[PDB]
Design an enzyme around this catalytic site. Structure first.
Site, mmCIF file in Angstrom:
data_model
loop_
_atom_site.group_PDB
_atom_site.id
_atom_site.type_symbol
_atom_site.label_atom_id
_atom_site.label_comp_id
_atom_site.label_asym_id
_atom_site.label_seq_id
_atom_site.Cartn_x
_atom_site.Cartn_y
_atom_site.Cartn_z
ATOM 1 N N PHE A 100 31.289 30.974 -12.458
ATOM 2 C CA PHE A 100 31.325 29.880 -13.418
ATOM 3 C C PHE A 100 32.066 30.344 -14.658
ATOM 4 O O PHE A 100 31.538 31.087 -15.487
ATOM 5 C CB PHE A 100 29.931 29.395 -13.807
ATOM 6 C CG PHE A 100 29.954 28.105 -14.573
ATOM 7 C CD1 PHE A 100 30.525 26.965 -14.008
ATOM 8 C CD2 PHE A 100 29.454 28.033 -15.866
ATOM 9 C CE1 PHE A 100 30.598 25.770 -14.722
ATOM 10 C CE2 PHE A 100 29.521 26.843 -16.593
ATOM 11 C CZ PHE A 100 30.095 25.708 -16.020
ATOM 12 N N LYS B 196 0.840 -1.187 0.000
ATOM 13 C CA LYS B 196 0.000 0.000 0.000
ATOM 14 C C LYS B 196 0.874 1.235 0.000
ATOM 15 O O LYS B 196 1.744 1.394 0.861
ATOM 16 C CB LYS B 196 -0.909 0.039 1.225
ATOM 17 C CG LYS B 196 -1.954 1.128 1.124
ATOM 18 C CD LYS B 196 -3.031 0.759 0.100
ATOM 19 C CE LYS B 196 -4.036 -0.213 0.702
ATOM 20 N NZ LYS B 196 -5.116 -0.618 -0.246
ATOM 21 N N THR C 199 -2.999 -5.461 0.424
ATOM 22 C CA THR C 199 -2.445 -4.133 0.629
ATOM 23 C C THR C 199 -3.321 -3.449 1.673
ATOM 24 O O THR C 199 -2.838 -2.655 2.475
ATOM 25 C CB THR C 199 -2.407 -3.291 -0.690
ATOM 26 O OG1 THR C 199 -3.732 -2.902 -1.061
ATOM 27 C CG2 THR C 199 -1.798 -4.103 -1.824
ATOM 28 N N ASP C 200 -4.614 -3.772 1.674
ATOM 29 C CA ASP C 200 -5.532 -3.185 2.648
ATOM 30 C C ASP C 200 -5.094 -3.580 4.065
ATOM 31 O O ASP C 200 -5.213 -2.796 5.010
ATOM 32 C CB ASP C 200 -6.963 -3.678 2.401
ATOM 33 C CG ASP C 200 -7.982 -2.978 3.286
ATOM 34 O OD1 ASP C 200 -8.275 -1.788 3.041
ATOM 35 O OD2 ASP C 200 -8.488 -3.614 4.236
ATOM 36 N N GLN D 59 28.862 21.829 -8.939
ATOM 37 C CA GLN D 59 29.504 20.558 -8.609
ATOM 38 C C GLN D 59 30.368 20.712 -7.354
ATOM 39 O O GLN D 59 30.323 19.874 -6.451
ATOM 40 C CB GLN D 59 30.380 20.071 -9.775
ATOM 41 C CG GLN D 59 29.601 19.538 -10.979
ATOM 42 C CD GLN D 59 29.295 20.601 -12.026
ATOM 43 O OE1 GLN D 59 29.070 21.767 -11.706
ATOM 44 N NE2 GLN D 59 29.270 20.189 -13.288
ATOM 45 N N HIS E 167 17.969 28.494 -12.908
ATOM 46 C CA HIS E 167 18.430 29.702 -13.564
ATOM 47 C C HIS E 167 17.698 31.003 -13.305
ATOM 48 O O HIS E 167 16.484 31.117 -13.494
ATOM 49 C CB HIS E 167 18.523 29.444 -15.065
ATOM 50 C CG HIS E 167 19.442 28.314 -15.411
ATOM 51 N ND1 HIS E 167 19.051 27.250 -16.194
ATOM 52 C CD2 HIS E 167 20.722 28.064 -15.046
ATOM 53 C CE1 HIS E 167 20.050 26.390 -16.296
ATOM 54 N NE2 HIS E 167 21.075 26.861 -15.609
ATOM 55 N N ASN F 193 20.076 23.471 -11.088
ATOM 56 C CA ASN F 193 20.617 24.821 -11.080
ATOM 57 C C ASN F 193 19.449 25.640 -11.614
ATOM 58 O O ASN F 193 19.239 25.715 -12.825
ATOM 59 C CB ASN F 193 21.825 24.935 -12.011
ATOM 60 C CG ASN F 193 22.656 26.181 -11.738
ATOM 61 O OD1 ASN F 193 22.168 27.153 -11.163
ATOM 62 N ND2 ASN F 193 23.914 26.157 -12.156
ATOM 63 N N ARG G 235 27.108 35.558 -10.074
ATOM 64 C CA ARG G 235 25.797 35.126 -10.548
ATOM 65 C C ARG G 235 24.991 34.602 -9.375
ATOM 66 O O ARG G 235 25.531 34.374 -8.290
ATOM 67 C CB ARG G 235 25.939 34.008 -11.596
ATOM 68 C CG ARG G 235 26.531 32.713 -11.031
ATOM 69 C CD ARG G 235 26.428 31.538 -11.996
ATOM 70 N NE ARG G 235 26.869 30.291 -11.364
ATOM 71 C CZ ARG G 235 26.900 29.103 -11.964
ATOM 72 N NH1 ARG G 235 26.516 28.976 -13.230
ATOM 73 N NH2 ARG G 235 27.312 28.037 -11.294
#
Lengths: 287, 287, 287, 287
Positions: C153, C12, C57-58, C213, C241, C239, C170
């Site tokens: 970067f 479940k 599952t119940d 990274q 932007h 990332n 940035r």
């Protein structure tokens, strides 16, 4: 200093119902998302917490399922029965708003009892009751359409914040959201829904667009001119921007072939197209 | 018969703007989701595709970013500048609707330029201009609250579709969605938002709820009684059901401890709490 | 030709549980989204539809609620109880995967039984049992962070498809999705989670980033170096932007102040930081 | 102990691409959501922030659009071109993972350049390159199906927490999420996708289900038995519960006609059907 209880309504929202019709081996499916809200004298419930007039939302839910057992011809017919029941079954309840989303299913290879969801569009219906008056608004949503050509946009004003280049060939993509109000409850709801859907699609595809506003106008016009039972249609169309990517930096050109489909922002064009003379501020649009 | 263009508006929706204030090493962040829509004489654009009056949605978008460069004290002030610009800058543009969602950020350990998003609530603001008239509605949404006790529900009518059992102790959970209309532009927008938020939370928590309608009423009453600049507050509160699980079949009792939090359906209680004698149906609520 | 049943599991998913601790007037709230799946000999269930080995599952769902009645110190402790129950209660069940998302609540003004949701992050826990061995992976997700400066970067290679411009300033914004594997079940789960969360935020904010990274490596290193009980941590950082908008077309400069926060596309940096000498491909990562 | 960089990958995710084929007046539309991630020697990028080996995610995005200009027969062949380009174009890039979702469009009334989205399913493709090995996994998701009858569930063990009753007639509804791995890249991708889709739908509809596990096994078997190029198919099927509403308290029976379609929780049945002797745990499944 002095506070007053204004407009109010309450009920059970989003009751998911699936009604299977199986008198014969040829099963039918009706899939709905129902919402029920009542209006009337609930003053004491708010100011004192006196629930004497408060029909429990749970009860409203049970009623939806109890009524579904008898089956219904259309979603609108089902909402009409619910609204009548609540407004007439309780003196303090003078009206309300009942709405539903209808989800479509297709048979798998024409099988008698096996289906697959058609998620390409969602049908809507809303019923509002006010005293002895009632109005129905049907609609469609989630239907995404696109023209790869036959769309232009030029001649717009250019102020100091304008950078958009005019064009005579661009992609026009939107999500068709439309709702129309009937001027009578005696309608072949399913037939009109299918008709309107086709008229909207046809108007969108066959109209040489000079602006999303014009395409939308033509779509609404087609509907009003075809159905006397519809007094007005409101549409909300996003301009889902498909940007022609600049490939020049890579030594290429892009003859209206490669596009970047941006999520946001998007243009949002909305308008009401109506029958000359009809009402322009109906309460059902307030929700 | 005769088709006519009714109410209409258009512009750019969901322009995501992040404004960083960094004149000093102590950076500040303003994060908005802005929508701009214009109203006026756009008849020809719709009926003939004549875009002479159509200030491009792209241009409206550019305006948002250019205006943000100058900075703004509050979201409402920013929207006010945008509205005045478009209405006054174009003769055929007589009004519009400018809205925004404001997202909150908290500093990471009081860092000068490192933040984490506070996703527990979203602040909203909507400005509508109609000729010489201006109206502003501020709001809060996505604020989920819950009372583990101090909530009752009994005394409601019982028909043949009622199965709900009365209770004097249940969980009351909802998502606070509230919108309030200002009666003046001279408001300390940030200070009032913080105050309204606290009043709503305080009323929800401290009110011994006999019904969600009552809790909502007390929430609205507190806001109106506290702020003279507010004429009305609207609320839409879902009753997010937490069902007390029946463990008796297993020989266990459940003293209001174990609950199943159901998604749908849910109760939906909505109401308008107004300053006595204030406008009954301001146009801004129509959208 | 010959078809074989391979890896398989069932149970479940998404059992929403709210456990209220109310032995004293000072209520506590534990809110979980629990998923239970079993592994073992279910060959006949798949090939013949024989359900003798199929614990419904119940039933698994009922078990979650029945166990919650006794309370639990931590989410991991609760999952451990479930895992042991199913694996030891049925001979054909040799293992499984039990997971949970834990949602946080804060008291409303320190109230004894009124709370508001802290939606700024979601805590996760996953228990996998395989015969006599078991492994636990804890994690955090939905934690959005942003640095308005202190991110660079440059120095990346350039080919015919490269158009990106180097930068020494940035915005660096991402959603912290991190998961770490414990090398033992004897851990102060709540304390470690809080510590890890803090270490990730600290490393993100304090690392002068030359690349996403690099930032991610620093975040993982801080965690591994601080907690002996953790063998490896996996992160998936988008990332998000934030494009510095070009305002020159409007006669204005943009000193790193006005940004467009794009939804898609987004950079996606992922990595596993491990304790030297630990397992390299633990089965719990397959799911 | 020392901290080590383990498995890692990075690239641009969710690059939305729309490719229009317009050499003739009969336009074709290809709509994809592309993700590109590289694998190789990125040690320095993580430990020292040295980006000499970091082919910008922005560059990867540009490459997707540039390659799109030349057109592509199928989504899989498009990914293959991208994959070979990066692995063969950079010595330090030894492989990677390229994936895409393909969205379907239908013509509006067979129009040459006007289309509407078919949202009833989404096609997926994933390519992983490791040296000279190219592994491809195709799939389908979002395809909801339902059988109104011809589904049973009985014979399961009744433990101390089992309350579920046996039944010989119930609704079986699920969302078909399936992924299959080809053992060769020389496949008629569009034809096999169509065939597989038809086989899954057929097995689901025509199998008299005694358990979702059985229905799933039969769906997988049909695929493997029909396609030699497929080594294994994995399925993740939710059991979307449609509870037969109890209307007896209202004096009515409910002959399998009125159902409540619950959102959560839901059974989640998953399994791998493989060709006997094929690879047990291909790395592409780890992602």
């Amino acid at each position: 200093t002095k506070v007053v209880l204004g407009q109010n309504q309450y009920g059970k929202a989003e009751v998911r119902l699936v009604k299977v019709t199986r008198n014969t081996a040829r099963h039918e499916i009706q899939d709905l998302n129902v919402t029920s809200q009542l209006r009337g004298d609930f003053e004491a419930a708010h100011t004192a917490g006196d629930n004497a007039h408060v029909v429990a939302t749970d009860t409203q839910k049970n009623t939806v399922y109890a009524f579904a057992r008898d089956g219904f011809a259309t979603t609108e017919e089902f909402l009409l029965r619910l609204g009548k029941h609540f407004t007439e079954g309780f003196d303090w309840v003078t009206g309300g708003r009942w709405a539903a989303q209808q989800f479509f299913w297709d048979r798998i290879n024409d099988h008698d009892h096996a289906f697959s969801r058609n998620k390409s569009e969602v049908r809507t219906a809303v019923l509002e009751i006010s005293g002895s008056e009632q109005a129905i608004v049907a609609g469609i949503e989630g239907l995404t359409v696109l023209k790869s050509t036959g769309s232009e946009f030029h001649g717009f004003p250019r102020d100091k914040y304008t950078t958009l280049q005019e064009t005579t060939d661009r992609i026009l993509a939107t999500d068709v959201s439309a709702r129309w109000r009937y001027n009578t409850v005696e309608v072949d709801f399913d037939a009109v829904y299918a008709s309107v859907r086709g008229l909207l699609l046809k108007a969108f595809a066959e109209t040489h667009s000079l602006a999303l506003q014009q395409t939308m106008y033509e779509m609404g016009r087609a509907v009003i001119e075809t159905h006397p039972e519809i007094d007005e249609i409101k549409m909300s169309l996003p301009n889902k921007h498909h940007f022609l990517v600049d490939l020049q930096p890579f030594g290429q050109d892009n003859p209206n072939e490669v596009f970047y489909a941006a999520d946001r922002p998007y243009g949002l064009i909305e308008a009401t197209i109506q029958r000359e003379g009809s009402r322009a501020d109906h309460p059902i649009w307030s929700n």
